[PDB]
Structure formats: structure tokens, C-alpha cells
């Protein structure tokens, strides 16, 4: 019985954070290879009772994109998603894209306070916001859109998704996020609360991958049409339409556009 991979917790997990892989027949896992660059020590791999899940801490960043390969007693299987799709990152605040203006913070995690680990600099939206507040903290940034050598111009927007890593300290009630691109606010995603692509829940106290259809923030038919808006704007805006004051602490990194 061959091993099978059904899902991976993130395509770009933060170094020092837990990677979880779900699937079947993870029996006597003898190797987990990351992007043909390094192996996870077998002793550092945790396997569930029913052999349907493995997890491990990512010890270092791959330098190139690739896939995860899992060897079990039944054979070897490769994850279908591209792992560490570095070429798909549009904004990381460390040389891909840049912050232009906004009330927000930028942090390099220090191992002692949230978000504890980071891949370099991340965006912070943190602090206390009054009830019914429609302009609070935000970042207006310039993205570096994915090259058409990676995503051809004729790919439908319907076939693409926006992914990013997010850390939420504690759940909150009231505050929401807007994500907008190319100053097309009519097409923006509004009222968004970060939820995990892996669990469907707002995970707290750890990084999660968040994913939305690119059509939820882009109105154009194809990727080329989107590029021809001739704007590198990407904006992340926090407000609080709730009836109570709230304090939140949310971090973002590695915005990326990938194929569904």
C-alpha cells in the first residue's frame, strides 16, 4: 500500500514552525526530503496512530522551489503542490515588494514574543481599535507581480489564488481586513477574518497559511488583463465595524499568487 499525500499545511511555512502533512499509509516513514535539498531527521518526524498524518519542524528554508517526498514502507510519494514557491511571492517586505505608507508596524521575530519566528520582516497590524472604526491601521504597498514566465498571461483569474502566511495572537470579535489590488476597491475582499487553508479555523498562537480565490480581490478575466491595469498596489486594511473596542495582534508575510 503506497503512501498518499492529501494536503500540506502550507506551501511556505516559516522556518522553525510546524509543517503538517495529511494522507494515508504513512507506515514506517524512513525519509522526508524537502525540495531535494535536505532531509528531515526521522527521529524528528511525528506520525499519527493511524498513519494518516505526519508533522515536523522546518529546520531551514529551501533555497529553491520543489516538492516534499515521503518514503514509507509502501514506497515514495511526492506532494503535488510546489513547496516554497519563491518565484510566486509578490510581497515579503525584504526585497520583494515594499511598503509605501500606512499606520502599521514591521517586525523581525525574536524568539521571545509573538510571532516568535519569522522569515525576515513581516507586517504587523497590532493594537487597540475603538468600536465602529472605519479607518485604523493599514499598509499600502507595491507588489512585484509574478512574471508571465511563471504564470502565463492567458491564465484565468478564476484559476489563481492569493496565499499568505498569517499569525493571529488571539481570536477577536469585530475587527476585519480588506485586501485590495491595483486600486480597484470595487473588486476588493472586504470583511475578512484570517482562517487556515488547512483547518478552516482561525488558528491562534502559531502561523497559518491563508488562501483566497484571486477573483475575490481581482475583477479581470485573465492574468494579463490584471497586469494591464498597470498598478503595483496591494493594500491590507484593518477596521472595526464591531460595537466594542478590541485589541488585536496579527502578522502577515509572503503574499504569493499561485495556481489553484
Q: What is the CA radius of gyration of the chain?
A: 19
Of these, 74, 120, 127, 156, which contacts Na ion (CB under 5 A)?
A: 120
Which residue's CB is nearer to Na ion, number 22 or number 206? 206
Residue that has been written with the C-alpha cell 468600536 in this structure: 131
Least distance CB 94 / Na ion (angstroms): 5
The footprint of Na ion on residues 213-232 (CB under 5 A) is 227, 230
Q: What are phi and psi of 24, to 5 degrees?
A: -145, 150
Counting residues that bind Na ion (by CB under 5 A) gives 8
Q: Does 253 bind Na ion (CB under 5 A)?
A: yes
Which of left, alpha, beta for 72 (phi over 0: left; psi -120 to 50: alpha)? beta
CB 66 within 8 A of CB 53: no
Minimum CB distance to Na ion smaller for 121 or for 133: 121
Piece in contact with Na ion (CB under 5 A), picked from 30-38, 51-59, 91-99, 177-185: 91-99
Q: How far apart are CA 162 and CA 259, in angstroms?
A: 9
94 binds Na ion (CB under 5 A): yes
- Is there binding between residue 52 and Na ion (CB under 5 A)? no
Least Cβ distance, residue 219 to Na ion (angstroms): 16
The total of other beta-carbon atoms located within 10 Å of residue 50's CB is 9
- Closest to Na ion by CB, 177 vs 251, is 251
**Interaction between residue 92 and Na ion (CB under 5 A):** yes
CA angle 177, 215, 211 (to 5 degrees): 55
Could you give the 3-state DSSP secondary structure of residue 43? helix
The footprint of Na ion (CB under 5 A) covers: 92, 94, 119-121, 227, 230, 253
Amino acid at each position: 500500500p503506497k503512501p498518499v499525500v492529501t494536503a500540506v499545511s502550507s506551501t511556505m511555512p516559516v522556518v522553525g514552525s510546524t509543517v503538517t502533512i495529511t494522507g494515508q499509509n504513512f507506515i514506517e516513514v524512513s525519509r522526508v526530503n524537502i525540495n531535494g535539498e535536505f532531509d528531515i531527521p526521522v527521529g524528528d518526524i511525528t506520525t499519527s496512530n493511524t498513519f494518516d498524518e505526519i508533522s515536523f519542524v522546518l529546520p531551514q528554508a529551501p533555497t529553491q522551489s520543489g516538492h516534499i517526498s515521503v518514503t514509507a514502507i509502501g514506497g515514495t510519494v511526492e506532494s503535488a503542490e510546489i513547496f516554497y514557491p519563491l518565484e510566486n511571492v509578490i510581497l515579503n517586505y525584504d526585497g520583494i515588494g515594499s511598503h509605501v505608507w500606512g499606520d502599521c508596524s514591521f517586525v523581525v521575530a525574536d524568539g521571545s514574543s509573538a510571532p516568535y519566528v519569522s522569515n525576515g520582516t513581516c507586517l504587523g497590524i497590532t493594537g487597540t481599535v475603538s468600536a465602529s472604526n472605519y479607518w485604523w491601521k493599514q499598509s499600502y504597498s507595491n507588489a512585484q507581480w509574478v512574471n508571465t514566465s511563471i504564470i502565463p498571461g492567458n491564465i484565468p483569474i478564476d484559476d489563481l489564488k492569493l496565499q499568505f502566511e498569517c499569525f493571529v495572537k488571539e481570536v477577536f470579535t469585530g475587527p476585519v481586513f480588506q485586501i485590495a489590488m491595483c486600486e480597484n476597491f470595487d473588486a476588493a475582499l472586504n470583511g475578512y477574518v484570517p482562517v487556515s487553508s488547512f483547518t478552516g479555523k482561525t488558528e491562534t498562537g502559531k502561523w497559518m497559511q491563508c488562501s483566497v480565490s484571486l477573483s475575490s480581490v481581482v475583477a479581470d478575466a485573465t492574468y494579463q488583463d490584471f497586469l494591464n491595469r498597470n498598478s503595483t498596489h496591494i493594500g491590507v486594511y484593518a477596521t472595526n465595524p464591531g460595537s466594542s473596542q478590541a485589541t488585536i495582534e496579527v502578522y502577515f508575510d509572503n503574499f504569493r499568487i499561485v495556481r489553484k
